[PDB]
Amino acid sequence: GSNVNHLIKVTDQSITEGYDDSDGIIKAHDAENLIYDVTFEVDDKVKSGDTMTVNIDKNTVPSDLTDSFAIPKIKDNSGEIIATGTYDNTNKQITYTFTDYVDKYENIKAHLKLTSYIDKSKVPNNNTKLDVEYKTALSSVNKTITVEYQKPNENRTANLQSMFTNIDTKNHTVEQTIYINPLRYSAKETNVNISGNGDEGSTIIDDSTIIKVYKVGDNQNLPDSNRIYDYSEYEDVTNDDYAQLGNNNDVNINFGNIDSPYIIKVISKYDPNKDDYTTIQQTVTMQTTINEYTGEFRTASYDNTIAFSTSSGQGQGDLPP
C-alpha cells in the first residue's frame, strides 16, 4: 500500500461557515465551525492498502475541546466501508486507507463533509484575518475569514467573561476558563459565584469541583481566545479558604478589593445521564460593591454551553460487469 494522492481527482471543494448571519467572520466564541466539503474520484488503479491525505487549515482543529475523536469512515450506500481515516495533530492531516472495496468496485467517487474549529493556540487574538486553506490529495481551496472573539460583560466595576476549554466525555467533566476583571477596574468587595444551575443546562458543583485561581501581572495580557495553554506563565494564588460552596449547586469565591485581572480554571462534572451535550451549561456571576456605606452592589454574569458538530464520508462504486 502506497500514496495514491496523484490518482485522486478532486471535482469540487468548498469551505463553508457554520452560521449564515456573519459571513466572512468566524464567531469562534459562538462555536461557529468551518465546514470543508470535497468530492473526488478514485482511479481504478487504486488498490487495497493505498492511502490518500486530507488537510485542514493549520489554524484549525477537528475538535476545539477534545483531542480524541473518530475520523468518519467513508461508506457507500449499502454500508460497505471504502476507507478508514486517522488524524495527525502535528500537521493537521488526515490519512485515509482504502479497504478491499477498491479491488472489488470501479468508478469509485466519494464526498467528505468535515467540521473543524479555530485552533485557539494558533489564534490568540481577536480580529485575526486568515487565509484558510484546506486540501484533499493534491488539490486545495482557500477562503479569507476573520476570527472574532467575545467581549466581557460589565456592570459598573463588575466585569468578566468565560469559556469552556475542555470536555472529558469519559469522566463526564468540563473545564471552564474564567477571566475576572479583565478590564482592570477597581472592583471593591469582589465575589465570584460559579453555578451549575443554568437556564438551558447544568453542571454539578460540589466538594469534588476543582478550582484554581491565577493572578495576571501588570505586564501581562490575557489572550482574547479565553484559553490558557501555559498556566505556569501566571502566578498561582489559589487558596481554598476563600472558596465556599453555596446552597444552590454553586460556589462563592471571595476576591476582596482587586484592581488586576484574575483567571479561574474550574473543572466540574456533569450528569452522565444527559443525552444532549448542549444541556451542559455553567454560569458565573461577579459581584462588586459600588457603595461602601450602604453595601449597594452590582452584578455581571456570563455562561457557557457545550456545542458540537459532526463529520461524514460517503462514497459509491460500481460492481463490474
Binding site: A31, S63, D303, S311
Partner: peptide, 11 residues
Amino acid sequence: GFFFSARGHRP
C-alpha cells in the same frame, strides 16, 4: 464521532 466547542452568553 463528535467534535466539540462551546458558546458564550451575556445576561
